[PDB]
Design a protein around this ligand. Sequence first.
Ligand SMILES: Cc1cc2nc3c(=O)[nH]c(=O)nc-3n(C[C@H](O)[C@H](O)[C@H](O)COP(=O)(O)OP(=O)(O)OC[C@H]3O[C@@H](n4cnc5c(N)ncnc54)[C@H](O)[C@@H]3O)c2cc1C
Ligand code: NA
Length: 302
Amino acid sequence: SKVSVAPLHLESAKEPPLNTYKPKEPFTATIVSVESLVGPKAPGETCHIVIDHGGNVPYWEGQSYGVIPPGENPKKPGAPQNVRLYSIASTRYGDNFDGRTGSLCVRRAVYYDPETGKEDPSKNGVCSNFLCNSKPGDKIQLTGPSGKIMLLPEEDPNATHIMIATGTGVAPFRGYLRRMFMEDVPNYRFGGLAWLFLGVANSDSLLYDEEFTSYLKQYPDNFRYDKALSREQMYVQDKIEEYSDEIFKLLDGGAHIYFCGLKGMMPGIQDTLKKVAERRGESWDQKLAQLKKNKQWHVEVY
Ligand SMILES: Cc1cc2nc3c(=O)[nH]c(=O)nc-3n(C[C@H](O)[C@H](O)[C@H](O)COP(=O)(O)OP(=O)(O)OC[C@H]3O[C@@H](n4cnc5c(N)ncnc54)[C@H](O)[C@@H]3O)c2cc1C
Ligand code: NA
């Protein structure tokens, strides 16, 4: 049942690519598809964008692409816009299983007057709206890839990976999980435990839910999946708390734990972890220092 992927030479590099393309000479990639991931009751749109890089901008799971949106830099006359980074949401083979495309999971940044709700196109986020407004055949200026914080540690194919996402923070984990479960990668046969926790606003805001639910049926002994709906139920930290003893035992046994999404997710998580630890009679500060020393703690928030 795993999906054949090509070309297998993408497994041969011993280090991830970094800064293959730079802002002064980006790679001009082409949009394959853009689709909304969310339903009518979601508070805003999050879209899935598939980009054809032609095999010219390969990457490893957990890396980011840069995108240079069109127009002048408003702060620097006659200069290009600054790069915006996006976590790649695909495996290195991409959604067409061919090594030619990568995907992004992009939240539209829209401004609303806090009193009146009135819009202002000069205040929306440039790159996120550029991307979600894109159509097949459109060109995008791609840079990178960049980043190493979120590379998947593969030395132990039986490791445990606890993945904590809010919103678009799911992106690297979609790539991890396809590599672990979906794709036929003969040199990486995952036999550990992957546990995804996802916090979103409501059921219509869920991202890739059918995919993750399918892994529960395909790999019941290797995958777990828990959701938190803040407006319906509940934050992701409340779900960690529900499983606190299991999680703390996995951490003590060597599990990796990952956090990705908007940085506002982290204070509540740190508060919860401190309280859980205290109830167990442990110091969260001591435990976190040990997790960081042991290279178990991975955070990419923005
Ligand atoms: C490592 C990394 C990974 C990331 N991964 C993702 C990802 O997977 N998905 C994702 O969606 N994002 C991700 N981001 C965030 C992304 O890089 C962008 O910051 C985000 O998309 C907003 O960029 P933008 O160009 O749309 O908005 P910008 O044009 O940069 O505007 C920034 C914000 O300012 C607001 N604003 C602009 N004008 C005003 C004004 N006058 N008054 C009030 N508000 C105003 C905009 O509405 C917006 O909210 C990631 C960031 C990092 C660093
Ligand atoms: Na949905």
